[PDB]
Design a protein around this ligand. Structure first.
Ligand SMILES: Nc1ncnc2c1ncn2[C@@H]1O[C@H](COP(=O)(O)OP(=O)(O)OP(=O)(O)O)[C@@H](O)[C@H]1O
Ligand SMILES: [Mg+2]
Length: 290
């Protein structure tokens, strides 16, 4: 830490506080996260080689006196803040599409190396002035554990959690990050979270009320999951024309496949990049005021 000057406190999250800092020798402006168990050091160290332009770069790992400091590339804004700033107008569709496309490329890269994010959400999607968007904190949930409250006792967002996780599947796949991104895609288009649950049962029941209570027809094996109960109410599925209205039929087809109940059938990131929705994809630059 003596090599870094804390410029400001950016925020705090699940695992610790994040500061904007300046490297006192390289001159570099970085984001410093102050979070050590053996398995986590090893796991965090492999993240250093998972480099991709749509993944926030992990520059260095500082393990000192029982404390762990992760040094990241710094981006000027997160997607929650961008959404809140664009609320009156909504993010134009071409930027939504470009962002979704780029995040899918990030996901196909990590997923092809068998690494899952596990906790995608707007705060973990960072943007710059050029039109790029990157996934932040990739791999940290597996490296450290995912607590019900943050280190600041603040609540864990359930809004983007895939239903297999909520139903108690222990070994879920890379399909959980596709569910999350699907949820974030719907939220960019409508300017409202898709499933804002405020407890596990609330989250699950918000899914069931839009997508229909899953059964053995749509998801073979669902009724035998750990937290599955035969007493769950039976709600009908709703039309995506009603769920994300402005979106065209390519968008709606892609989103429903990203929200498939059965994780084995949900589209993978690589097939999603070939969907017809991305046929006219471009890379606009956002209106960003730093
Ligand atoms: N590399 C980074 N560059 C710039 N700002 C960042 C960076 N990483 C995190 N921040 C921002 O700082 C704030 C704190 O992030 P942090 O990761 O602690 O919590 P979170 O993303 O909301 O939750 P989680 O801890 O589960 O990731 C968030 O708004 C995040 O957007
Ligand atoms: Mg984060």
């Amino acid at each position: 830490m003596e090599n870094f000057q804390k410029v400001e406190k950016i925020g705090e999250g699940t695992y610790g506080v994040v500061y904007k800092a300046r490297n006192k020798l390289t001159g570099e402006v970085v984001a410093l996260k102050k979070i050590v168990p053996s398995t986590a050091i090893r796991e965090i160290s492999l993240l250093k080689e998972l480099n991709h332009p749509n993944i926030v770069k992990l520059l260095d790992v500082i393990h000192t006196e029982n404390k762990l400091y992760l040094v990241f590339e710094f981006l000027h804004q997160d997607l929650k803040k961008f959404m809140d700033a664009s609320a009156l107008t909504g993010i134009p569709l071409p930027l939504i599409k470009s962002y979704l496309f780029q995040l899918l490329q990030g996901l196909a890269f990590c997923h092809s190396h068998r690494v899952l994010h596990r906790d995608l959400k707007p705060q973990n999607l960072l943007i710059n002035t050029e039109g790029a968007i990157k996934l932040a904190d990739f791999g940290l949930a597996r490296a450290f554990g995912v607590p019900v409250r943050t280190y600041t006792h603040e609540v864990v967002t359930l809004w983007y959690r895939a239903p297999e996780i909520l139903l108690g599947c222990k070994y879920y796949s890379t399909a959980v990050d596709i569910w999350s991104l699907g949820c974030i895609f719907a939220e960019m288009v409508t300017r409202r979270a898709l499933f804002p649950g405020d407890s596990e049962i609330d989250q699950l029941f918000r899914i069931f009320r839009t997508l229909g209570t899953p059964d053995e027809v749509v998801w073979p094996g669902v009724t035998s999951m750990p937290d599955y109960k035969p007493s769950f109410p039976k709600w009908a599925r709703q039309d995506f024309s009603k769920v994300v209205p402005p979106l065209d039929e390519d968008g709606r087809s892609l989103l429903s496949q990203m929200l498939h109940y059965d994780p084995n059938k949900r589209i993978s990131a690589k097939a999603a990049l070939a969907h017809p929705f991305f046929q006219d994809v471009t890379k606009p630059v956002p209106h960003l005021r730093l």
